[model samples]
Target chain A: NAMPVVKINAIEVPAGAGPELEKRFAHRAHAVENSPGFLGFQLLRPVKGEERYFVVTHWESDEAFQAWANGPAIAGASLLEFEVVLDVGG
Target chain B: MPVVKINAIEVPAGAGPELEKRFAHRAHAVENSPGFLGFQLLRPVKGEERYFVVTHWESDEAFQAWANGPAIAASLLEFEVVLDVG
Candidate 1:
């Protein structure tokens, strides 16, 4: 059996755009929840300074994560070409 | 105010879920400990072998006290013991 895989997708948007972008991002996260093999997800927002968003999602396998990423959820969220100043996927 | 953040990373060989289940009790204890702030567990989606656990505390003292306690001391003994600092 393969170990349960998890992904921490750190997305950073401009500082001033946080308030306006949060709702849209929240909706994007909802899309992941509705996907298959979704173990859990954590929405981490910078509490101190700067506007950064970290979406950590857990899955049963790597294939499961890829299915969600290549699906409409990624494009429907407008995150495909969204202005991400810094992005790290791990 | 002071804060403490300790992170642990390990590689699992098809045993990540079992490890998490074993640590669940310890996690609860850490959450209820004095000055506990938050905790996060991160794993690599493409690599099932990589895993990370991060814990935040209100102060270094509070965190260290727990680290020195029997429960944590015993629990940590099983890890690889790669990093330890004061």
Candidate 2:
């Protein structure tokens, strides 16, 4: 397996800025989709009443991810990186 | 498009292999659960020493029922994807 790298930025919204957050992302630049080695992206909104949300991205390797993370002012929720060990469906 | 639940667990170095070892078997059963969108078992590479069990569900109820039925970990974090790109 290539064992894609997953980077998560779990951020705390500044309250009252929730709608703004969504709006900004809604019109995102989409620069990431075109980046090399990029696999996918997702903007996650908390559903359990928590104030935090997650910004997740998948990459082909550690080197490929650093290219984007280092090149762009892109975006985060205090990133936690992970390597895929197993996947089922979806 | 769906709800996600992340169950995080911190495995001791000696116990890590067993964790994944057993999950391989457990995973075969999880797919049959109703409303399952996907599942990913992740190993931490930075920040925390937690292994994240990521599961995507069709809805909140499906997750709750399944968790109540069989589950685990150190903490739980959940989200509903507002945007997704493949």
Using TM-score, give the best candidate's number: 2
Chain B TM-score (model 2 vs. true structure): 0.85
DockQ scores for all the models shown? 0.06, 0.64
Q: What's candidate 1's DockQ score? A: 0.06
Alpha carbon deviation, residue B28, candidate 2 (Å)? 1.3
Tens digits of lDDT, candidate 2, B1-86: 57888888878977878898888887886787888888888888787698988888888888778777844557888889787886
Candidate 1 wrong stretches, greater than 4 Å: A48-51, A72-90, B1-51, B55-86
Scored by lDDT, the top model is: 2
- In candidate 2, chain A reaches a TM of 0.80
Cα error of candidate 1 at position A86, Å: 29
Which pairs clash in model 2?
Answer: A9-A77, A10-A77, A11-A77
Chain B structural similarity (TM-score) per candidate: 0.64, 0.85
Please provide, for model 1 over B14-71, each residue's C-alpha lDDT reduced to its tens digit, 9 standing for 90 to 100. 7766766655655767777777765555543442333555565555567779888786
Model 1 RMSD in Å is: 11.6
RMSD to the true structure for each prediction, in A, is 11.6, 3.2
